[PDB]
Amino acid sequence: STGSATTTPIDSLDDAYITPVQIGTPAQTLNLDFDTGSSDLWVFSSETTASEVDGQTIYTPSKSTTAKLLSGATWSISYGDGSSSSGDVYTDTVSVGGLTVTGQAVESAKKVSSSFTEDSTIDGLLGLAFSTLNTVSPTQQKTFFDNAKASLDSPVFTADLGYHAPGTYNFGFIDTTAYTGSITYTAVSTKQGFWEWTSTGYAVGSGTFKSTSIDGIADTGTTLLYLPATVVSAYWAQVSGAKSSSSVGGYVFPCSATLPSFTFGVGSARIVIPGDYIDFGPISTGSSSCFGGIQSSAGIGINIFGDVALKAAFVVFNGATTPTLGFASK
Numbered sequence: 001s002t003g004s005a006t007t008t009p010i011d012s013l014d015d016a017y018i019t020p021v022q023i024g025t026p027a028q029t030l031n032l033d034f035d036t037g038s039s040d041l042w043v044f045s046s047e048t049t050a051s052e053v054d055g056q057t058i059y060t061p062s063k064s065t066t067a068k069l070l071s072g073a074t075w076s077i078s079y080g081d082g083s084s085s086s087g088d089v090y091t092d093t094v095s096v097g098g099l100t101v102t103g104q105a106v107e108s109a110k111k112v113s114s115s116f117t118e119d120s121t122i123d124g125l126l127g128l129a130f131s132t133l134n135t136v137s138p139t140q141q142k143t144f145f146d147n148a149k150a151s152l153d154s155p156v157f158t159a160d161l162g163y164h165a166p167g168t169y170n171f172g173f174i175d176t177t178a179y180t181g182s183i184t185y186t187a188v189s190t191k192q193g194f195w196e197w198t199s200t201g202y203a204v205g206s207g208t209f210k211s212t213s214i215d216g217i218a219d220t221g222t223t224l225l226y227l228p229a230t231v232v233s234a235y236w237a238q239v240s241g242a243k244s245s246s247s248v249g250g251y252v253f254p255c256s257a258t259l260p261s262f263t264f265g266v267g268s269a270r271i272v273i274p275g276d277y278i279d280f281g282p283i284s285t286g287s288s289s290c291f292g293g294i295q296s297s298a299g300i301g302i303n304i305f306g307d308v309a310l311k312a313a314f315v316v317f318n319g320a321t322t323p324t325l326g327f328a329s330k
Contacts, residue, residue, distance in 0.1 A: 001151045002172035003099025007034065007161065010121040013280055014307060015223055017161060018122060019169055022095040023106055024064030030057050030123035034169055035221025036159070036195055036317060037304075039133035039143050040077050041094070042085055042107035043124035044116075052112050055120030061108065067092045075107045075135045080222070080300065085112040089136055094144060096126075099171050101148050105134075105141035125221065128157065128317065133193035145171070145319060155319045159220050160330065161311035163277055179314035179328035184269035188323045192302075194219070195317060197325050199305075200267060202227075204235050205260030209270070216303030218310060218317070218325055224280070225262070225273070226297035226304040235262055235294050242292070248283050251292040255282060262294060264309060266327040273312040 007019040018031035023043065030043055044053060046060040061067035067090045076086035087110035094104040109124070116122065127134070131142045149155045152172030160178055161167040168178070189196045194217040201211040214227065232251065236242040238260050242253035253259070259275030278293035293308040316326030 001099055001148070002153055002170070003095075003097035003148075004168060004170045005097030006166050007169050008166045009162070009164065010119070012164070014161075014164060014311065016122065017167070017220070017307070019096070019126070021126060022093075023059050024061070024092050025066040026064075027095070028057075028059055028064065030059060031121065032124050032126040033122050033221060034126050034128055034159075035219070036128040037217060037219035037221045038077065038079065038125060039127040039129045039131055039193065040075060040107050040135055041105065041124070041126045041144055042075065042077070042087070042109055044112070045087070045108040047087060048109045049111055052117045054117050057123045059106065059108065059124075061090045061092065061106075064092055066102075067106075070105065070136075070139075073105075073136050073139060073141075075137065077135045081115070083113045083115040085109045085116060087111065089141070096144065096171065097169070099148055099152075101144055104144055104147055105136060107136065128220070129195065130190050130193045132190075145317075148172075149319055157317050157319070159310060159315045159317065161220065161307055163274075163311050167311070174316060179330040181329055183314070183316055183326040183328040184266045185316070185318070185324045185326045186266055188325055190323060194302075195323070195325055200265030202231055202265065203263040203270075204238050205275075207238075209263065209265070211265075214264075214303055216297075216305050218305050218315060220307065220310060222304045222306030223293075223308070224304075224306050225278075225294045225308040226300055226306065227294065228303065229296045229298045232294055232296045235260070236292065244296075248289075248291070250295045252283060252289045253292055255288045255290040257290075264305075269327065271309070271313045271327055271329060273309060277308055277312060
């Protein structure tokens with residue numbers, strides 16, 4: 001089997017991407033944030049505290065003839081940005097782009113943090129990291145990909161995120177028309193539960209490539225590119241007026257700037273992030289100070305190749321017995 005679904009930016013800045021997912025019988029379609037940095041499929045639901053729902057589409061398990069309460073199971077997750085959610089668990093039929101899993105754990109939110117409530121466009125998350133990170137207790141549950149894998153034509157999914165445009169998540173096949181050149185594959189460590197890999201270095205604009213190992217994660221659920229302070233300082237030093245602002249919470253730059261590109265290494269290959277991908281717009285409405293899309297990972301404890309990096313590539317998440325990651329230009 002295979003599946004193919006379009007993923008759409010939630011706003012004009014590509015702050016996140018949503019992908020329609022069918023849950024239950026008859027189908028209830030929710031727009032979920034596909035997140036290769038976590039491993040829970042959770043949804044706003046009829047059980048979510050009413051005051052914490054503001055415009056989201058909810059899953060109502062009582063209206064699904066295939067929903068079953070997973071007795072005694074609860075979940076609770078806290079993300080790196082400080083957001084969180086928790087609740088109980090159903091199993092139900094879940095389909096993405098024509099690919100169907102029966103018996104998928106659908107984690108129904110009883111509580112969500114303010115940041116989720118305040119964003120009407122995201123109806124929940126669909127985790128695509130390794131199932132070892134799944135928070136369901138007392139019986140850990142598998143991700144949608146893990147459940148689908150054996151049925152797939154090939155045990156892979158691909159992320160093809162657009163810049164200020166829709167893109168595609170494919171399951172079970174590699175669309176050879178979706179990228180240019182060849183796909184370069186690189187080793188993955190699953191020890192922390194992430195798609196963790198080592199970049200071979202970077203360049204700023206038309207500058208020389210610096211060969212240096214940068215361990216980090218391929219994370220579709222993080223907006224920005226978080227890298228060591230040395231790297232980030234080297235990038236922003238090429239932008240007149242750019243500075244790190246403790247009050248804003250990162251590097252800012254004059255909105256009048258033309259940003260340089262940023263290149264990262266994948267083995268001997270190179271992925272170029274155009275400068276425009278690094279502009280996240282005014283820090284507040286009407287401001288001429290703009291927020292940068294490359295930020296320091298210092299104090300996160302991990303480097304994160306988020307959407308800013310991933311959207312410059314066609315990315316293969318290869319879930320073979322020994323997982324790997326593939327990157328191609330596009």
